[PDB]
Design a protein around this nucleic acid. Structure first.
Ligand SMILES: [Cl-]
Ligand SMILES: [Cl-]
Ligand SMILES: [Mg+2]
Ligand SMILES: [Mg+2]
Ligand SMILES: [Mg+2]
Ligand SMILES: [Mg+2]
Ligand SMILES: [Mg+2]
Ligand SMILES: [Mg+2]
Ligand SMILES: [Mg+2]
Ligand SMILES: [Mg+2]
Ligand code: NA
Ligand code: NA
Ligand code: NA
Ligand code: NA
Ligand code: NA
Ligand code: NA
Lengths: 154, 95, 156, 140, 186
RNA sequence: CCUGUCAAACUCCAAACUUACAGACGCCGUUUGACGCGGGGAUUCCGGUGCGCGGGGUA
RNA sequence: AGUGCAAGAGCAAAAGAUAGCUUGACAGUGUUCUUCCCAACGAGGAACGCUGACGCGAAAGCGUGGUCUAGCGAACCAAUU
RNA sequence: UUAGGCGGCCACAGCGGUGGGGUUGCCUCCCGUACCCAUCCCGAACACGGAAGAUAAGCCCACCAGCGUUCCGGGGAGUACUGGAGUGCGCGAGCCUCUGGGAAACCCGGUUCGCCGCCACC
């Protein structure tokens, strides 16, 4: 399971790419979604490879992000341990986290918005004109690489 | 195009590779299809009759009745619905 | 007329004589030079390597070839070496000589398409590379920059 | 093995390539059965432009009819060698051709499952000379 | 054979066994096919239908297993063919088969020929086949009469030992008679 | 036999890709009625530019 | 090779060749595709049927002109069935 | 299938070549023209009738790879070309990097001298 984050805006981006971002529930820059590692999803992230940043996040970092930016399918409600236990199958954020990563469930399945609307990266990211392998911030990331970015946008 | 005949620009699609040259096996000209069955359209270069307009080469229709020995296949061209009169020689069971 | 008008490989290949008429004759006199009676039984084999795809008019071919071979007469009219220009000017070229109305031009020449790194000339010589010089003069008359390459020859 | 490998005559074609006939009459007597017209192909200068047009006749004799003809034909010829087919045939003379072959030829002349006669089973010039030579005359 | 671009006929045309063009026209009827085949010594009749991996023979009869019902005569003749036709026909009927079209392979449509004879027999057997009465033999020649009369110009028996000296078209009747009621494999 | 080259109107080969249909996931629709149908009212049929692919042309 | 004619495409127990017979180059009316991709638009054109009458074949069957893509013309008025 | 008949796929099956096989199930070559039927001339063919002889053809069986064809290994080649991205390079033609695809010729070594269906049958 990979964490997706849209790093480039819609103006000028191919329509079929945009649409794909849309079917992955992200509709704005800095929006993030968690996506299963399947043939069908892989094709989608690849298509979107050039306007996003993705990779497998650490249990920890998922937990930070979840807690900080997870939202109910509707409303303000903070997704904190309690919320999670009093609303989901799990007992606490951590247990939700582990289940996502092990792709045993999805944010929707647990009453949550599929979208983690992150905050701009504190300190700025590595640029949206080059992939990681080039010093930029686009494309697949290290689990260590994704974490840093997610964490920066916590 | 310089002209607008039916065979306009059909050189490749209406020409056999050298080894597939000459009359074709009848078994497939006699193939029977039921109403509802999905069939891919494709013209057999060897077979002159029971043909359809070259443009449809590639479509996968739904046989829906027949006319004479010829089948009536319903297809959708772009967004338009269409019925095509074609023989078993030029069809194939999908899957 | 300038090389600038035809030196790029930007138009389609146009070589079907069955559909073209009035093609000027090539000015290239020969492709095999030297002792053509002998086969590449030479110790040393240098080549003139073109460094960018381009078109080369039969004009430039003949001038580049004369200039090198006419010089390889540092070895004698019946000298021990064989020279070879491997490209032929297939590509028919036009000119629109009415303004831009009915402009598909009229055949005015032929040119050979050389990709960067192809060898256009190959010379065979015993340890006696005056040929290296025949080529400094030849790539002087073709559009591209060139590389003078030696293959069988570690007699340095 | 042999018996089924020994030569035999299969038809002797006697044709008169004229250029426009009254000649049939003689072929009919010299052989013993009706001749057949010889139309020609292509238009040519020898005022022979007519496509479908009688230009000679022929007669294909089989079995006895053939021998009984050769038994007078052959004597009138001398030649041999070089003048033989690579398949063991020969034509001499008015023409008189002699097609020669071995027992299982029908295989190549029938309708169903027909097939071409293997090169081994074909008759060689040599094996041909022998057969005929061994029947009232001499080779070369 | 010669190169990459060379065209090799289909196996059954190589062998000069199947006339595909005639085979298409036959298959159009959508009915089963009465395959009428001869040999120097025997005559075969099949009732073939179309299948996914190749023809299916639902009913057949060989001039050989004719004796199995009392045939003591040669088997590459007229009466022989008819009866094989009729025999295949009856096994056909038994099969639940009602109609077919005569496929005569590479044989020729000569009148009063053995294939037609095969045809006539299968018809009489209860099979509904498209036909033409005046291309069939005059019954008498189907009985083998032409042969009895041929042996009248005897001086030497037509049959080497075999059965009889003057032959029997009557033997013919006795057999058709036998096939038209009861018996095994029918 | 050996040796030197080509193809928009060549092909023994042959992609990426584009495309028909089906299933799966995805997204969407069943109080925001999609898909689709019928009808009223238009505007519009001088376009341009970047990129990729082009055809023509020295450009 | 040949298959009337451009160019491209089909064809070998044939779609070509020879022979023989025959007039389906038939009347009537349709279905569909095309003309006009998608997506409305006439004439025209084609593919595929039916009804009726025939031709040839043992028969399945083939013949809705020429192997396929060009060879085509509205209202009004006249003549004709 | 100790030899058959109808096929499907239509060369992995084509081309060439070697070996083996028949008082019988057989298939053929073969023998023979009174008949049905036949040749613009020939019982060659077609058609009919038949067993004196034969396994030489055909055919069936077993095999060979020299050509043609199919597929595979390793090499060519992740080369050529390419869908998406770039304030990367280049005077420019054009190149490069990242991401998702990915070839052709040719060479060397294997494979391929058909496979499968229904029927009939010491
Ligand atoms: Cl037969
Ligand atoms: Cl159509
Ligand atoms: Mg909300
Ligand atoms: Mg700051
Ligand atoms: Mg920046
Ligand atoms: Mg094209
Ligand atoms: Mg395209
Ligand atoms: Mg027609
Ligand atoms: Mg009038
Ligand atoms: Mg043998
Ligand atoms: Na074909
Ligand atoms: Na002017
Ligand atoms: Na230069
Ligand atoms: Na119309
Ligand atoms: Na005549
Ligand atoms: Na044999």
């Amino acid at each position: 399971m990979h964490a997706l984050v849209q790093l480039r805006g819609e103006v000028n981006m191919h329509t079929d790419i945009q649409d794909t971002l849309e079917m992955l529930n992200i509709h704005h820059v800095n929006h993030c979604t968690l996506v299963p590692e399947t043939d069908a999803y892989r094709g989608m992230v690849a298509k979107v490879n050039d306007f996003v940043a993705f990779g497998e996040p650490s249990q920890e970092t998922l937990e930070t992000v979840l807690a900080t930016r997870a939202e109910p399918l509707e409303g303000d409600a903070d997704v904190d341990d309690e919320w999670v236990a009093e609303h989901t199958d799990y007992d606490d954020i951590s247990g939700l986290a582990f289940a996502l990563l092990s792709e045993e469930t999805t944010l929707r399945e647990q009453g949550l918005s599929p979208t983690l609307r992150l905050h701009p990266p504190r300190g700025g990211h590595d640029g949206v004109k080059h992939p990681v392998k080039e010093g930029g911030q686009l494309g697949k990331h290290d689990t260590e690489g994704i974490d840093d970015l997610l964490e920066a946008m916590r | 195009p310089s002209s607008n005949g039916p065979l306009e620009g059909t050189r490749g699609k209406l020409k056999n590779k050298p080894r597939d040259r000459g009359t074709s096996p009848p078994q497939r000209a006699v193939e029977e299809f039921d109403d509802g069955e999905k069939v891919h359209l494709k013209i057999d270069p060897s077979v002159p009759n029971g043909r359809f307009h070259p443009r449809f080469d590639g479509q996968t229709g739904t046989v829906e009745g027949k006319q004479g020995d010829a089948y009536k296949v319903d297809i959708v061209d772009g967004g338009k619905e269409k019925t095509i009169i074609v023989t078993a020689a030029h069809l194939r069971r999908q899957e | 007329k300038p090389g600038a008008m035809y030196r790029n490989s930007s138009k389609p290949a146009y070589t079907r004589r069955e559909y073209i008429s009035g093609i000027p004759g090539k000015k290239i006199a020969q492709f095999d030079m030297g002792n053509n009676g002998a086969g590449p039984t030479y110790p040393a084999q240098v080549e003139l390597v073109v460094e960018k795809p381009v078109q080369i008019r039969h004009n430039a071919l003949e001038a580049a070839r004369v200039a090198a071979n006419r010089y390889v007469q540092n070895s004698g009219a019946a000298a021990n070496y064989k020279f070879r220009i491997r490209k032929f000017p297939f590509h028919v070229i036009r000119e629109n000589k009415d303004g831009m109305r009915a402009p598909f031009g009229k055949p005015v020449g032929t040119a050979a398409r050389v990709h960067g790194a192809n060898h256009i000339f190959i010379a065979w010589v015993n340890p006696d590379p005056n040929v290296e010089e025949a080529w400094r003069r030849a790539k002087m008359k073709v559009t591209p920059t060139i590389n003078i390459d030696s293959s069988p020859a570690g007699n340095a | 093995f042999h018996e089924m490998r020994e030569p035999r005559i299969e038809k002797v074609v006697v044709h008169m390539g004229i250029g426009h006939a009254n000649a049939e009459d003689i072929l009919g007597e010299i052989t013993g059965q009706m001749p057949v017209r010889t139309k020609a192909k292509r238009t040519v200068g020898e005022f022979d432009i007519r496509e479908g047009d009688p230009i000679g006749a022929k007669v294909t004799l089989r079995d006895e009819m053939a021998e009984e003809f050769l038994q007078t034909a052959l004597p009138l010829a001398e030649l041999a060698t070089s003048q033989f087919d690579d398949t063991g045939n020969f034509s001499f003379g008015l023409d008189v051709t002699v097609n020669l072959v071995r027992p299982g030829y029908r295989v190549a002349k029938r309708d169903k499952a027909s097939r071409s006669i293997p090169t081994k089973h074909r008759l060689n010039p040599a094996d041909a000379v022998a057969f005929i030579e061994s029947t009232y005359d001499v080779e070369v | 054979a010669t190169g990459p671009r060379y065209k090799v006929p289909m196996r059954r045309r190589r062998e000069a066994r199947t006339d595909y063009h005639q085979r298409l026209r036959l298959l159009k009827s959508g009915k089963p096919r009465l395959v009428a085949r001869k040999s120097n010594k025997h005559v075969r009749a099949q009732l073939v239908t179309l299948g996914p991996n190749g023809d299916d023979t639902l009913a057949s009869a060989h001039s050989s297993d004719l004796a199995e019902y009392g045939w003591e005569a040669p088997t590459g003749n007229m009466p022989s063919a008819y009866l094989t036709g009729l025999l295949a026909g009856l096994r056909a009927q038994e099969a639940g088969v009602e109609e077919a079209v005569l496929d005569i392979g590479l044989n020729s449509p000569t009148p009063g020929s053995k294939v037609f004879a095969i045809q006539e027999g299968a018809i009489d057997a209860g099979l509904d086949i498209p036909h033409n009465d005046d291309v069939l033999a005059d019954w008498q020649r189907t009985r083998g009469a032409h042969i009895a009369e041929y042996d009248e110009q005897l001086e030497e028996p037509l049959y080497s030992g075999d059965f009889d000296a003057a032959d029997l078209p009557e033997h013919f009747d006795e057999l058709r008679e036998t096939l038209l009621d009861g018996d095994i494999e029918l």
